[PDB]
Design an enzyme around this catalytic site. Structure first.
Site, PDB file in Angstrom:
ATOM      1  N   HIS A   1       0.804  -1.220   0.000  1.00 53.36           N
ATOM      2  CA  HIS A   1       0.000   0.000   0.000  1.00 53.36           C
ATOM      3  C   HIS A   1       0.840   1.274   0.000  1.00 53.36           C
ATOM      4  O   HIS A   1       0.307   2.376  -0.106  1.00 53.36           O
ATOM      5  CB  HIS A   1      -1.036   0.002   1.137  1.00 53.36           C
ATOM      6  CG  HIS A   1      -0.526   0.531   2.442  1.00 53.36           C
ATOM      7  ND1 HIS A   1      -0.357  -0.274   3.547  1.00 53.36           N
ATOM      8  CD2 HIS A   1      -0.336   1.802   2.870  1.00 53.36           C
ATOM      9  CE1 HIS A   1      -0.081   0.478   4.598  1.00 53.36           C
ATOM     10  NE2 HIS A   1      -0.062   1.742   4.215  1.00 53.36           N
TER      11      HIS A   1
ATOM     12  N   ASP B   1      -0.658  -7.338   1.975  1.00 47.55           N
ATOM     13  CA  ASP B   1      -0.041  -6.015   1.975  1.00 47.55           C
ATOM     14  C   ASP B   1       1.457  -6.207   2.171  1.00 47.55           C
ATOM     15  O   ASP B   1       1.979  -6.081   3.281  1.00 47.55           O
ATOM     16  CB  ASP B   1      -0.622  -5.158   3.101  1.00 47.55           C
ATOM     17  CG  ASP B   1      -0.274  -3.692   2.958  1.00 47.55           C
ATOM     18  OD1 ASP B   1       0.299  -3.310   1.916  1.00 47.55           O
ATOM     19  OD2 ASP B   1      -0.590  -2.914   3.883  1.00 47.55           O
TER      20      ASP B   1
ATOM     21  N   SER C   1       3.806   2.350   8.043  1.00 51.44           N
ATOM     22  CA  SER C   1       3.559   1.213   7.164  1.00 51.44           C
ATOM     23  C   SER C   1       4.791   0.721   6.428  1.00 51.44           C
ATOM     24  O   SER C   1       5.622   1.511   5.992  1.00 51.44           O
ATOM     25  CB  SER C   1       2.462   1.537   6.163  1.00 51.44           C
ATOM     26  OG  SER C   1       1.223   1.670   6.835  1.00 51.44           O
ATOM     27  N   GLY C   2       4.888  -0.597   6.287  1.00 47.36           N
ATOM     28  CA  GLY C   2       6.016  -1.189   5.592  1.00 47.36           C
ATOM     29  C   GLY C   2       7.194  -1.413   6.519  1.00 47.36           C
ATOM     30  O   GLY C   2       8.128  -2.149   6.184  1.00 47.36           O
TER      31      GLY C   2
END
Lengths: 4, 366
Positions: B152, B206, B302-303
């Site tokens: 994402h 994701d 995120s990530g």
């Protein structure tokens, strides 16, 4: 429900 | 805790496999399939791959704490994912066994809401993914040139690779002493539905890989993190650490200095309950956080890495067990952080790097  | 059945020596890189019938450790007899045996062994243990391999002679190298040998069924090896399934006890008369230098990971080389400023070298695998100068996501180094992150992080407006940069080796965002390299390719999971339909609410898969345009040097501030070993389960209740430069409060700003926070793994039974996320935690996803909230990841994280430390390889190592993915607000009670379960994508990772080793651009991969 929110993406990070 | 119980050791992993596959081990590699820190003294001379000899591979050692557990024999459950004897409770002993055995060496792997040298064969023409040494290359793949070394590769599979490293992958099995949670390392990304085998850098090189070689032969050792028991007559000059000794047995060093082993009792016998295992021989690889070179007929079954090509059609297996688990090394333990294709080995059997053998005499190995010439006494030559396999040594493999797996790529070291998960170890420090030094002499987010509700978290705290961290220090250089504490989480050497953490990288900042920036687009047109803005930090947007975290990432975790799996090697000098491959980073694991979230799919994402690449919506329609952030797909021109020449405009992405990967910042490593520093905890302060504005530090001119880190290293920042370009991006050659981004391999995203083809099962991540919102990639093609941003309106989609199904966030499974994701995950994505970023191949840097050149490799980063490994130092006391830049090191790759390990992956969960084959069959290694996520333990409910275990306290792991999540890091990132994301917002320090949902309505707050991003952190100037990398933040670290400790959060426990929450069971699917609890997290999918109505008081929590109400059946929204799909397979290959997991929660981590406190029922009380207060400490959690957030936008901008995120990530990034959710790492857990263990000593199953006979030495403490940090393993990337989750990737920051989503949540409802940040740090809310009964709304923990949701993470991509890395162990469920082990084979996807190994194969993606092999298949797209030198690819360029955005690449989909199921």
């Amino acid at each position: 429900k929110q993406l990070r | 805790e119980p050791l992993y059945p596959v081990q590699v020596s820190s003294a001379d890189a000899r591979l050692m496999v557990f024999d459950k019938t004897e409770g002993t450790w055995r060496l792997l007899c040298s064969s023409r399939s040494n290359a793949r045996v070394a590769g599979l062994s490293c992958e099995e243990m949670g390392f990304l791959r085998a850098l090189t391999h070689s032969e050792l002679d028991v007559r000059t190298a000794g047995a060093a704490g082993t009792s016998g040998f295992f021989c690889v069924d070179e007929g079954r090896l090509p059609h297996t994912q688990r090394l333990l399934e294709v080995i059997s006890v053998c005499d190995c008369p010439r006494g030559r066994f396999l040594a493999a230098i797996c790529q070291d990971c998960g170890r420090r080389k030094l002499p987010i809401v509700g978290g705290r400023d961290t220090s250089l070298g504490r989480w050497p695998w953490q990288v900042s993914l920036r687009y047109d100068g803005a930090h947007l996501c975290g990432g975790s180094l799996l090697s000098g040139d491959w980073v694991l992150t979230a799919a994402h992080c690449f919506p329609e407006r952030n797909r021109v690779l020449s405009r992405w940069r990967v910042f490593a080796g520093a905890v302060a965002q504005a530090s001119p002493h880190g290293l920042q390299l370009g991006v050659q390719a981004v391999v995203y999971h083809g099962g991540y539905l919102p990639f093609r339909d941003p309106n989609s609410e199904e966030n499974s898969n994701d995950i994505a890989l970023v191949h840097l345009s050149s490799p980063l040097p490994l130092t006391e501030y830049i090191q790759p993190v390990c992956l969960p070993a084959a069959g290694q389960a996520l333990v409910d209740g275990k306290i792991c650490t999540v890091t990132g430069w994301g917002n320090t409060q949902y309505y707050g700003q991003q952190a100037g200095v990398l933040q670290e926070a400790r959060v426990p793994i929450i069971s699917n039974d609890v997290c999918n309950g109505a008081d929590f996320y109400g059946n929204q935690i799909k397979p290959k996803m997991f929660c981590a956080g406190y029922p009380e909230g207060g400490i959690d990841a957030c936008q901008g994280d995120s990530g990034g890495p959710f790492v857990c430390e263990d000593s199953i390889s006979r030495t403490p190592r940090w393993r990337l067990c989750g990737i920051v993915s989503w949540g409802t607000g940040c740090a809310l009670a009964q709304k923990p952080g949701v993470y991509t379960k890395v162990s469920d994508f082990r084979e996807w990772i190994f194969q993606a790097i092999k298949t797209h080793s030198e690819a360029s651009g955005m690449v989909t991969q199921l």
